[PDB]
RNA sequence: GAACUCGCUGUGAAGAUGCAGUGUACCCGCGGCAAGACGGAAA
RNA sequence: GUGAAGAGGGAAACAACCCAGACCGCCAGCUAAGGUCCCAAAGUCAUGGUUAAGUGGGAAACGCGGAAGAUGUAACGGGGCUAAACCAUGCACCGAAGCUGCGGCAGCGACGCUUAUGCGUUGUUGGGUAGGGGAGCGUUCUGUAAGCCUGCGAAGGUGUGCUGUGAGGCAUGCUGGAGGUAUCAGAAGUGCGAAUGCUGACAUAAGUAACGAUAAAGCGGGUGAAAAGCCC
RNA sequence: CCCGGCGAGGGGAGUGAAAAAGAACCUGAAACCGUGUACGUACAAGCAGUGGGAGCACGCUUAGGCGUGUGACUGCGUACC
């Protein structure tokens, strides 16, 4: 902190107006290593319980021939899902391309597969690629 | 009914005038101001005016029945004070509410 | 229920005349004192005063106990930079005086002390003016 | 002479008690002008026992 | 079930924050004495 | 994240000051001396709860030894009385009789002096 | 025409229609109870007691109300020591409300 | 630090306005001595 | 052994003198030391004796003498006690937080049902410095949370009542006029009473010094509501 | 519009939902200075509190001795680090 070390102790003092703190925190990352085993035995473990608890949903295939936001939506609620997060594996345009309008909707891949995402959504929708994909990527 | 007449930022200290208010709380508003007006307060000035400017105000917008003014509450505060070195001036607040009854 | 307290304006309190001639000093003293502290009374709460109006008589006739007349002396000091009684002045001029400060260390010291002390109504001379309130001479 | 402890409001209070003004209550009314005026004073209108003043 | 998952008993511990009161135990000197 | 603690300070010295109420002056106004007057409070409290039994054991005392003058019998003699007569009424039982009705309290100790030799 | 008894250990002079505090009892509300330990009955001609436990005397007792007593704050501090607790506390209470004595 | 701030005897970190006993004193201001005043200072 | 690190009762006031180790509460009792004339609660109790001097109620060696206590009684705590002093014995009473009577709270050993236990209980512990261990309350933010309350009233301040063994929590009147946020997990710039600690405000001595070279001021008129310090 | 000194300031009316937003301008506790209300005190001594507690006014149960505001009086009691 600027200021003067002169003797009026010192200006730049913790009990004093204007003064540094004498614990000031640092600028370090907070992240922490997770071993891949942890990693596995986690997803292992949540997908085994969704299914027992009947939240979990497998289908032959989602998708809309067109990116049409109102198709999805009545598509949506034929299957009376509100908040459901897709999971899929190869990216289709049509299907990416209107992902982020709907903010309880979202489609994502095997491949980047987030834990928080999977707790946090009311239910998952599978595709018979993608569950093979993904017992294949736990294994 | 009742009107009331507060002086805000008075130039003067808020005890003497506060000596001044004491001699003339309870007393009826006829013989009041002929006693303050024959005191030898400086701060009695002040109290008069107010007085007098409250009385006006309660006659022009209310029955005046000057002979039947009677006050009930008054009090001097101490108000706005600003420091500076050669030390604070002392502010005060004169409120006076004089009803009828 | 609560303890029972009695209340200042509800307590009865009589006359009582005392002759202290030819009695010991200590002993009606202490009697004395009890009798105006209430205890005596059941009724008795140390925060009012429960007890009786006491008039004593005939105090120049006090039977002095043992060689005390001329031994036994109180010094009492103005508050200066003290003052000299012998016994038997004092008993000459006013055995009242005497009985009051005698009574007044048998009370409690305090205000309420003061009060109880005010109800003593000494007299060196056996006839008294109070017999306008009927009160009940007890020889004791 | 020099302060040790620190007076609360009662010692103020106390000795401020006798500090207090009093009314004059001597007010007299002048016989001709018939207006109220300090006793051995003189009335603004310029008149005092009745008679003439100066009356500036 | 959204979020409802808690540690186990035992394996996370608030630890001692020494020097708050006299509640809390040590509270003064630090635990080094004087 | 700083935190402020005007909340939790002013909760305390409101608490603190709702107890302390009328204690001439400085000590019901100003929270540094206000502390020790309700701690000091709270202990002579306490202590005075502890010694009340014996204050109103004596004043129980104190009315029965009365009584028992007026009825004419020494305290300690009307106590043994009734003690070796087997009886087991409390001393607050027996101020209550003598203050409030005389005549049981008269026939209580008639009969402890029946009972008595 | 008031009656002497003690339920949980304290003596207690009660007379007739009065309500008094007892100590918290394992007592319904709803069922009466009875009190056969006397020690003193007053009446015109007091009955006297040659031993304790008399017999002739029976009370009847119907709690009404369930409660705690006043809260009281008991802290416990030494001077210069560093040592200070304070806690609050309460005592359950019961009312009765008396009828009828046997004389 | 706050005082509803008296004198003696005894106790007291050892000469106590605040502890125990005793005694004095209606409440409150004004001009002086400074005997106290552990505030400076004075071997 | 006590203080260290234990409160209480008695000795006038006490930490080393005597009794006695405080879980809390109840207008109950019984005791230890210590007392039974008042102050101040209990025997002015009973029996065998000394005291003439207030020695008691301060004093060694030596045969009532030896033997003086001081700001004011001041070496019974004050009175006074010729026993209300003292030596011996007897029965009693007062007497603490010590014990018992009743109610309640938390832990620790032992068991019969029983399980991620509550009972029947059986005994005990609960004074505490340094220190150690265990169990909890309050606040910011993050996901919960595009849920919930909210201009029919949120926070913040303020008064009341209730509740918990506790830090606290709950509902409510009032200025207030825009946000707050259940439960569950994650980090503190996390809880203030002192360090001649710092910043802003204020009481204080008090309406008390003093108004600063002891060259000295006035009278009539004018302006100004108000003139002896302005102008003539 | 009025008082006030053509000052300052205040009052009424009006604008403004609120002026309880008036330019010394969001919300406005405490330290500090008061008014009105109920209580106590001018013969009583000491960490100024506590326990008991008659009295003095109010809401109450529409008395049933309940609480709130103060405490005449007394036992006890030498602050914090």
């Given at each position: 902190?600027?200021?003067?070390?002169?003797?009026?102790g010192?200006?730049?003092?913790?009990?004093?107006?204007?003064?540094?703190?004498?614990?000031?925190?640092?600028?370090?990352?907070?992240?922490?290593?997770?071993?891949?085993?942890?990693?596995?035995?986690?997803?292992?473990?949540?997908?085994?319980?969704?299914?027992?608890?009947?939240?979990?949903?497998?289908?032959?295939?989602?998708?809309?021939?067109?990116?049409?936001?109102?198709?999805?939506?009545?598509?949506?609620?034929?299957?009376?899902?509100?908040?459901?997060?897709?999971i899929?594996?190869?990216?289709?345009?049509?299907?990416?391309?209107?992902?982020?309008?709907?903010?309880?909707?979202?489609?994502?891949?095997?491949?980047?597969?987030?834990?928080?995402?999977?707790?946090?959504?009311?239910?998952?929708?599978?595709?018979?690629?993608?569950?093979?994909?993904?017992?294949?990527?736990?294994? | 009914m009742?009107?009331?007449?507060?002086?805000?930022?008075?130039?003067?200290?808020?005890?003497?005038?506060?000596?001044?208010?004491?001699?003339?709380?309870?007393?009826?508003?006829?013989?009041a101001?002929?006693?303050?007006?024959?005191?030898?307060?400086?701060?009695?000035?002040?109290?008069?005016?107010?007085?007098?400017?409250?009385?006006?105000?309660?006659?022009?917008?209310?029955?005046?029945?000057?002979?039947?003014?009677?006050?009930?509450?008054?009090?001097?505060?101490?108000?706005p004070?600003?420091?500076?070195?050669?030390?604070?001036?002392?502010?005060?607040?004169?409120?006076?509410?004089?009803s009828?009854? | 229920?609560?303890?029972?307290?009695?209340?200042?304006?509800?307590?009865?309190?009589?006359?009582?005349?005392?002759?202290?001639?030819?009695?010991?000093?200590?002993?009606?003293?202490?009697?004395?004192?009890?009798?105006?502290?209430?205890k005596?009374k059941?009724?008795?709460?140390?925060?009012?005063?429960?007890?009786?109006?006491?008039?004593?008589?005939?105090?120049?006739?006090?039977?002095?106990?043992?060689?005390?007349?001329?031994?036994?002396?109180?010094?009492?000091?103005?508050?200066?930079?003290?003052?000299?009684?012998?016994?038997?002045?004092?008993?000459?001029?006013?055995?009242?005086?005497?009985?009051?400060?005698?009574?007044?260390?048998?009370?409690?010291?305090?205000?309420?002390?003061?009060?109880?002390?005010?109800?003593?109504?000494?007299?060196?001379?056996?006839?008294?003016?109070?017999?306008?309130?009927?009160?009940?001479?007890?020889?004791? | 002479?020099?302060?040790?402890?620190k007076?609360?409001?009662?010692?103020?209070?106390?000795?401020?008690?006798?500090?207090?003004?009093?009314?004059?209550?001597?007010?007299?009314?002048?016989?001709?002008?018939?207006e109220?005026?300090?006793?051995?004073?003189?009335?603004?209108?310029?008149?005092?026992?009745?008679?003439?003043?100066?009356?500036? | 079930?959204?979020?409802?998952?808690?540690?186990?008993?035992?394996?996370?511990?608030?630890?001692?924050?020494?020097?708050?009161?006299?509640?809390?135990?040590?509270?003064?000197?630090?635990?080094?004495?004087? | 994240?700083?935190?402020?603690?005007?909340?939790?300070?002013?909760?305390?010295?409101?608490?603190?000051?709702?107890?302390?109420?009328?204690?001439?002056?400085?000590?019901?106004?100003?929270?540094?001396?206000?502390?020790?007057?309700?701690?000091?409070?709270?202990?002579?409290?306490?202590?005075?709860?502890?010694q009340?039994?014996?204050?109103?054991?004596?004043?129980?005392?104190?009315?029965?030894?009365?009584?028992?003058?007026?009825?004419?019998?020494?305290?300690?003699?009307?106590?043994?009385?009734?003690?070796?007569?087997?009886?087991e009424?409390?001393?607050?039982?027996?101020?209550?009789?003598?203050?409030?009705?005389?005549?049981?309290?008269?026939?209580?100790?008639?009969?402890?002096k029946?009972?008595?030799? | 025409?008031?009656?002497?008894?003690?339920?949980?250990?304290?003596?207690?002079?009660?007379?007739?229609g009065?309500?008094?505090?007892?100590?918290?009892?394992?007592?319904?509300?709803?069922?009466?109870?009875?009190?056969?330990?006397?020690?003193?009955?007053?009446?015109?001609?007091?009955?006297?007691?040659?031993?304790?436990?008399?017999?002739?005397?029976?009370?009847?007792?119907?709690?009404?109300?369930?409660?705690?007593?006043?809260?009281?704050?008991?802290?416990?501090?030494?001077?210069?020591?560093?040592?200070?607790?304070?806690?609050?506390?309460?005592?359950?209470?019961?009312?009765?409300?008396?009828?009828?004595?046997?004389?």
């Amino acid at each position: 902190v600027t200021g003067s070390g002169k003797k009026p102790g010192s200006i730049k003092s913790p009990i004093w107006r204007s003064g540094g703190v004498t614990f000031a925190a640092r600028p370090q990352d907070h992240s922490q290593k997770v071993n891949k085993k942890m990693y596995r035995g986690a997803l292992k473990s949540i997908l085994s319980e969704l299914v027992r608890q009947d939240r979990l949903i497998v289908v032959e295939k989602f998708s809309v021939e067109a990116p049409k936001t109102k198709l999805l939506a009545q598509k949506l609620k034929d299957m009376a899902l509100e908040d459901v997060l897709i999971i899929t594996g190869e990216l289709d345009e049509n299907l990416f391309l209107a992902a982020r309008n709907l903010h309880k909707v979202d489609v994502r891949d095997a491949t980047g597969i987030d834990p928080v995402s999977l707790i946090a959504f009311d239910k998952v929708v599978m595709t018979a690629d993608a569950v093979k994909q993904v017992e294949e990527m736990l294994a | 009914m009742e009107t009331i007449a507060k002086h805000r930022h008075a130039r003067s200290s808020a005890q003497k005038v506060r000596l001044v208010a004491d001699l003339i709380r309870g007393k009826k508003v006829s013989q009041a101001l002929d006693i303050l007006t024959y005191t030898n307060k400086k701060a009695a000035v002040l109290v008069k005016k107010v007085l007098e400017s409250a009385i006006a105000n309660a006659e022009h917008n209310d029955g005046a029945d000057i002979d039947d003014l009677k006050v009930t509450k008054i009090f001097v505060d101490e108000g706005p004070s600003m420091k500076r070195i050669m030390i604070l001036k002392r502010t005060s607040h004169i409120t006076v509410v004089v009803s009828d009854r | 229920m609560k303890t029972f307290t009695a209340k200042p304006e509800t307590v009865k309190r009589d006359w009582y005349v005392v002759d202290a001639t030819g009695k010991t000093l200590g002993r009606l003293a202490t009697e004395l004192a009890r009798r105006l502290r209430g205890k005596h009374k059941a009724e008795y709460t140390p925060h009012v005063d429960t007890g009786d109006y006491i008039i004593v008589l005939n105090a120049d006739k006090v039977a002095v106990t043992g060689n005390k007349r001329t031994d036994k002396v109180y010094y009492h000091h103005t508050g200066h930079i003290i003052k000299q009684a012998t016994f038997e002045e004092m008993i000459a001029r006013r055995p009242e005086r005497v009985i009051e400060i005698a009574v007044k260390g048998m009370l409690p010291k305090g205000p309420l002390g003061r009060a109880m002390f005010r109800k003593l109504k000494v007299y060196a001379g056996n006839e008294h003016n109070h017999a306008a309130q009927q009160p009940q001479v007890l020889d004791i | 002479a020099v302060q040790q402890n620190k007076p609360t409001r009662s010692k103020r209070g106390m000795r401020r008690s006798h500090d207090a003004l009093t009314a004059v209550t001597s007010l007299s009314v002048d016989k001709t002008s018939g207006e109220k005026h300090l006793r051995h004073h003189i009335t603004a209108d310029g008149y005092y026992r009745g008679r003439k003043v100066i009356a500036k | 079930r959204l979020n409802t998952l808690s540690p186990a008993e035992g394996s996370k511990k608030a630890g001692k924050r020494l020097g708050r009161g006299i509640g809390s135990g040590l509270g003064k000197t630090g635990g080094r004495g004087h | 994240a700083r935190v402020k603690r005007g909340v939790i300070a002013r909760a305390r010295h409101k608490k603190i000051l709702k107890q302390a109420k009328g204690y001439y002056g400085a000590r019901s106004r100003v929270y540094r001396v206000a502390f020790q007057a309700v701690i000091k409070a709270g202990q002579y409290a306490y202590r005075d709860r502890r010694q009340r039994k014996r204050q109103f054991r004596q004043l129980w005392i104190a009315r029965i030894n009365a009584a028992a003058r007026q009825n004419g019998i020494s305290y300690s003699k009307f106590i043994n009385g009734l003690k070796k007569a087997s009886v087991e009424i409390d001393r607050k039982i027996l101020a209550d009789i003598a203050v409030f009705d005389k005549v049981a309290f008269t026939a209580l100790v008639e009969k402890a002096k029946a009972a008595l030799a | 025409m008031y009656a002497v008894f003690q339920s949980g250990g304290k003596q207690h002079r009660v007379s007739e229609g009065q309500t008094v505090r007892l100590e918290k009892l394992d007592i319904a509300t709803g069922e009466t109870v009875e009190f056969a330990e006397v020690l003193m009955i007053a009446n015109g001609e007091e009955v006297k007691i040659g031993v304790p436990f008399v017999d002739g005397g029976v009370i009847k007792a119907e709690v009404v109300a369930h409660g705690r007593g006043e809260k009281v704050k008991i802290v416990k501090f030494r001077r210069r020591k560093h040592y200070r607790k304070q806690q609050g506390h309460r005592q359950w209470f019961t009312d009765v409300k008396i009828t009828g004595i046997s004389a």
